[PDB]
Symmetry: D5
Subunit: 156 residues, 10 copies
C-alpha cells in the first residue's frame, strides 16, 4: 500500500457512516473483526480512521457493513491519523486516558528511563488490548495493555 | 490527611530537589520505594508531585533522600495534580503516550462502551505498572498495564 | 446499549432540529420528559446530545417531537460528550457556571479533601437538578444541586 | 473596603504560605472559620485569594495562622479573582466540576430559561455549600448546592 | 418565552440573511426599530443574534425585512450569545472596544470597587446607547454610555 | 517624553507596590488624583501601568504614596500597555466589560457605521469616566461613559 | 454607505469567486482597478473583503469580472475586517510581514515615541503602496511604504 | 561572530536595564546610534534584543550608556529573536502594525505575486526606516519604509 | 503566473480529489512526476496545494489523473501555503519531523550561526529530497536532505 | 544512566550559563566537541539540554567550559526534551525549519509512505548533520541531512 491521505475528515466522515450502518445492523466491533485475522483494537481503529486495512480484511468488513466500493478502497488508504477533535478530549470516557497522562506522565518517563535507558517506548511498534475482568470487590474493571518496543536514544 | 495544595509549583520544585538528591546518591526509584509496601509507580508519582505519601512512607523515603522536615511534610499533602507543563508534552518519551491517545482514543471509547456500557474507565479507582519483557525478534519491550474500574453512566 | 458516537456534530445537529420542533409545538422540557420516568435534567441532556435515552423514552419523546426513525435511533446512541463550542462558554447564562469554577474551584477541592479525603466527587455517578425558589428579599433564586459519589484516592 | 488588587499572584503566593502554616498547625478550614460567623466556603475562598475578609475575621484567622500584619491587610483587599492556573483545570478533583459543565452546561441554560426566563443565575448574588451524605448503596456522596439569584434580561 | 438556542450559528446565519435583505431595501437599524417601542441598540442586537424580540416586535421587523415564519420565530428564541468569532475581534471597529479593556480594564475594576464596593457592574441589568456629538476641535465623537446595576459581593 | 518601556512587568510590579502603600495609608484613587489637574481615570490608569504621568503629577502622587525616585521616574515613562494577564479576564468585575463586547460588539460596529460611516471610534483620542447614580427601583448603578473621536475610513 | 457586515465569511467567499473569475479572464489587479480612480492597494483590498468600494467602482469592477447583482452590492458593504485565517499567517509571503513585527515591533514603538510622543501611528488614517525597484547588486526589491497619521495620547 | 543565544529573556532583561540607563541619562535612540555608522533602527533593535552589534559599536553604545563588560559582550551575541510577549501585541502602538497585517496581509501577498511573481519579500535582506513628516492636512505622519529583497519560488 | 489564492481550502479540496483519482488509478507520485522535468518532491507538493505547477506540467499530470479544466488551472495558481491543519501535526509520520525541531531546533540555529554567521537558511531558495537506504544493522532508513541558501543578516 | 529530569528549565538554565562561558572563552561548538568522539550535533544538543552526555564527554566538555561538578552531573542526566519556548519558534533562523514543515510536511508523509509503506521515519534512531557548501550560482548553502530509521506500522 503506497496510497495515503492528508485530510482526516475524509476517513472520519466514512467512520460516521460505518457507525450508522453498524448501529442499524446491531453489530459489535468484536463481530466485525471476527474472521479478519486481526485484533479487535486494530480493526476498530481502522474503521475509525486511524489504521489501514489489508485488502482482504477491507472487503470482509465491507461485506459485513454493506459498504460501497469507494468506502472499501478508502479503508485501505494510509490515514492522516489523529482522532481527537482539538488536542484535549471533551468526552469523559476519552478524557480519563488523558488524565492518566496528566497524573502519571512523568512517572512513566522516569520508570522507562530506569528500566530501559534513554529513549522511548514505541507508539508504532505497538499493540494494545482491552480486557474486561471482574472487580473482586464488586463490579467490573478494564485491564488495558500497552505493549511497545523500547527504542534507545544512543550517541552518535 | 485533610491538607491539600492549590499551586502545583510547590511540589514540582520539591520534585526537582528530590531528583538532584537522588542523582547524587545514585538511587533508583525501585530502591526508594523498597520497604514502603507501596508500588513503585505510586511512590514515584508522589515524589514527582502527583500523589500523597502516608506519613510512614514519607519519613522512609525522606530519610533516604536527606530531605528536611518541611519537605517530608509536603510529600504527605494532597497535591494539585497535573504533571504536563502546557497540556501536550514536548518530551518524546512522554509524547508517545499522548500519541497513543491520538491514534486509539476513539477505539478505547468504542471498546469500553461495547464491553461495559455507557460510562468511563476510572483514572481514580486505578492502578498502573510498567514491566520490561524480552522481544522475541530481539530487543526489549515495555508492557504498561492500565487497570481501572468501570463506572457506569445510568439514567436518573 | 453498545453503540457509540465519535463525532459530536451529528447529535448536536439533531439537537438543533429538536429545538426547532420543540419551539414550533410550544413544548417545555418538563412536558417532553413527562411520562418517561426520567428526570428532566437527564432527558434534556439527552436531547442536547449529552446522554443516551433508553429505547422506550427515545420513542416517547420522539413521538412528542415528530422525529423520524433515524433520529429516534440517534438519541439511543452513546454520545461523544462535550457541549461547549470551544472550551469556555461565551453565553452569559452558561458562563456564570464557569465563573463559579474560577472563584470557588480551589475551595471545592479544599473542602472535598477536608470532608472526604484524597480523591474526587464523581461527575459520572452523579445527579443534577435545578429548582426555582423564592428569594426571601424579593425575586427568585435557582438552587442547583450537584450530587456526586465520593471516590477515594488510596495508595497501591 | 475600597482597596483592591490587580495581580492575582500576590494573594495566591499568600495562599501558599497560609497552606503551609495551616499544615504545620494541623488545622482544618472548618476550625479556621470557627468564630468568624462566616461560612466555611467563604472563609476558605478568602484564604485561597478569591474573597475579601472583613477586618475582624482577617485578624482572627491571621492570629490562628500566625500571619504578619501585611498579610492580614492583604486578606482584606478585594481580590483579582480567578483560581484556575490556565483556564481548564488539570487537577482531577477540580476537573470534575469543569466536566459537569461540559456535560450539563447547555441543560443548565435550557432549564434556567424554561423556569425563570431570559437572563442568568448570578455568580455574585450567590452562595454555595458542600455537604457529606451517606450513599444508601454504600460509601459517601457530596451534595454541593449552588444557590444564585435569577437576574432577568429584559428589553429596553 | 421559554424556548432557547444552543448553537449560535443558527441565529448568526439568520443575521447574515437579515443584513442582505436590509441592504437591498436600503434600510437603517433606526428605521427597522422604529415603531417597536424598543431601543435601537436592543433591536439591533436581536437582529444580530444577541437578544430575543417579543412577538409583536418580531412580527414588525420580520414584515419590514420579508422574513419567513421560521425566521420570525427564531428571532423570538432566547439566543446562545457571543458575537465574537474567536474571543478577540479582528475587525478594527470592534477591536477598539477590546483595546479600551486592555488599557482601562484594571482602572474600571479599581474605580468600581472604590465607588461601590466589592462586586460587579452588571452586563445583564444593563442598557447601552450610542450618541453622535460634535467635537469642538472639528469632526465628530461617539459618546457610548454603559449603564449597569451594581451588584455587591458580601460575606456569607 | 521620549522614553518608553517594552516589558509591562516593570510597571505592573510598581503598580503592586503602589497598591500596598495605598492600602497601608487608607488612600483612595480620588484623593491621590486630587491636585494633579487630571481625571481620576487617567491618574489611576497611570498608577496601574497604562498611562504616563506628566512630571508634576508624578511627583505629587509619589509624595502621597512615599515612592522612591526610580518609581517616580517610571511613572513618567510611556508604558507597554496591556492590563489583562492572558487576553480574557478571569476577574468577574473585569469580565463583565468583556461580556458587554461579546453581547454588543457587533451592535456597536453596526451603529457606529450607521451614525458615522466606515471607520472607527478611537481608543486613543478618548476619555472615560465612571459615575455612581441611584437606581429609582432601589440600589445603585454605574454610568460609564466612553467618549472617542470618530476617525473615518475613505478610499485612496 | 451605512450598511455593514458582521461575519467575514460572506465577503471572503465572494473573494474566492472573484479570484476564480479573475484567473479565468487572465486579469491583473492593476487592470481591474484601472478606471476606478482608486489605488490598486485599496481596490485589491476591497475585492479581498477588507475595504468597501464606492458604488461606481463596484459596478465597474463587477462588470469586468461578470459579477451578479448581489455580489456588486456586497462589495459596497462595510466589511468585517480580518484577512488572517487564524491570527498568525501560515503562508510564507504573508508570514514575512509578521516576522518584521516580531523583529522590529518594539523598535517601531520606541522610534514612534521618540519622534512623535505618546500615542500611535494610525492604521485608519493610513495608506500603503508596493513598489518594485532594481537591486543594484542584482535582482529586485519591494519598497513597501506604510503612511499613517500620528495620533497623540494626551492626559485628561 | 559565531556566538548565539537560545533564551530571549537574557537579552530582553538587558534591554530593560538599557532603557533605565537611557531614561536616567535623558538620551534618545538617535543620539545613541550617532557615531556607530549604523542606522537608528538597526542599533535600536540591537539594544532591544533583536540584532547583534559589531564590537566597535557595542563598545561605543556601552560607553554612552555606562554598561558593564558582560552587557557589552551580550550585545554582540546573535540573538534569539522575537520581541512580542505572546504572539499578538497588547500595546496599542505595536498593535496597529499587526492590524495593518489583518487588513492588508492578503493584498500584500496578491500585489507581491502580481509585481514580482511567486516567492516572498525578505525580512532578512531587509532595511527598515521610520520618517517623521508633516501632514499637509495638519499634524504629523510616519512614513515607514519596508525595503526587502524579492526571492522567487521556482520549480526544481 | 500572477494569479494567487487566499483560501487554502480550495487547493486542499482539490488535493483530496487528486488523491482519490490517484488511488483508483494505482499511481505513484514518482509516476505522476515522470516526464515533467520536475523533482518528485516539487510535483507532489503542488498536487497537495503547496506549490504552483507550470502550465506544461499541469496539463501532463492533469491528463494522467483525469482532472477537469478548472482543476488544471487551479494547480497553476500560486497557493496560500500551509499544509498543517492546526499548527502542530497530529499524524505520527509528520509529527516526527516536528519532534526533530523540538529536539534539534536550537542546535540547528547554533550550528548555522557557527558555520555561516547571523542570518537564516532559506525555506524559499530551497530543495528537498527523500532517499531510501539500507540500514547495515537490518531494515531501511530515510535520508532526507534539506538544501537551502544561506541569507546573511548584516548591519545597515 | 537511569537518572532523568522532569523540568526542562533546569538544563535550559545550565545551557544559558554554558553559552556565556563559551562566549567569554571564544569557543566554537566544533572545538568543544573535539576529542569527545561524538558528532558536533549530538554534543551541541546535549549542551543545549536536549541530549545526555556520557560521563567521559561530560567531564571533557566541562573542563573546556569550566563547569562546576553539579553542572557536569546535570549534563549526564536524561533530559526533559523540548527546546521551543512555546510550540512555534519566533526566531527567524529556527522558524525556517518550521516553515519547511508547513510547506512540505504532507509531501514528506506522502513520499515516506510511497517509498517505505505505512509507519514513520524515526526521530530516535536518528542522526543529523549540517554541512556548509558553495552555492553554484553564488553564495553559500546549508545541506542538512536527516537520517532516520524506517519503523513500519503493521497489522496485529
Amino acid at each position: 500500500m503506497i496510497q495515503s491521505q492528508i485530510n482526516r475528515n475524509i476517513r472520519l466522515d466514512l467512520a460516521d457512516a460505518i457507525l450508522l450502518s453498524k448501529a442499524k445492523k446491531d453489530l459489535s466491533f468484536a463481530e466485525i473483526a471476527d474472521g479478519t485475522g486481526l485484533a479487535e483494537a486494530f480493526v476498530t481503529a481502522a474503521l475509525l480512521g486511524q489504521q489501514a486495512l489489508p485488502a482482504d480484511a477491507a472487503r470482509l468488513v465491507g461485506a459485513k457493513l454493506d459498504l460501497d466500493e469507494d468506502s472499501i478502497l478508502l479503508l485501505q488508504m494510509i490515514p492522516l491519523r489523529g482522532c481527537i477533535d482539538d488536542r484535549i478530549p471533551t468526552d469523559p470516557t476519552m478524557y480519563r486516558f488523558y488524565e492518566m497522562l496528566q497524573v502519571y506522565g512523568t512517572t512513566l518517563k522516569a520508570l522507562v528511563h530506569e528500566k530501559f535507558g534513554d529513549g522511548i517506548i514505541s507508539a508504532i511498534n505497538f499493540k494494545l488490548d482491552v480486557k474486561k475482568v471482574a472487580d473482586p470487590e464488586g463490579g467490573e474493571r478494564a485491564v488495558i495493555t500497552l505493549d511497545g518496543k523500547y527504542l534507545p536514544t544512543k550517541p552518535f
